[PDB]
Amino acid sequence: ECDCSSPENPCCDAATCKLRPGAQCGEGLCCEQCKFSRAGKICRIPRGDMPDDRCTGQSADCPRYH
């Protein structure tokens, strides 16, 4: 298993398919240049008045309220 889906992704070492040194992530709504996006950054807009989702600063995915 690999940190990045695609071998083209520079966030991962080609040889291992694991994140390159210093990288936090390689993909997701909350990944920017191989690092976690800023905590509190909007990452998902619903229609209507349901709450938006924001990045946590500790994960590369955009969380959901449940």
Resolution of the entry in angstroms: 1.7
CATH number, position 30: 4.10.70.10
Please check whether residue 4 is in contact with residue 23, taking contact to mean a CB–CB distance below 8 angstroms: no
The DSSP code for 37 is P
Q: CA 41 from chain center: how many Å? A: 12
- What the block records as the tokens of 61 is 């995915």
Helices (H) and strands (E) in the chain, counts: 0, 4
Q: Closest by alpha carbon to 27, among 8, 56, 42, 5?
A: 5
**Method of determination used here:** X-ray
- The total domain count for the chain is 1
Domain residues for 1?
1-66
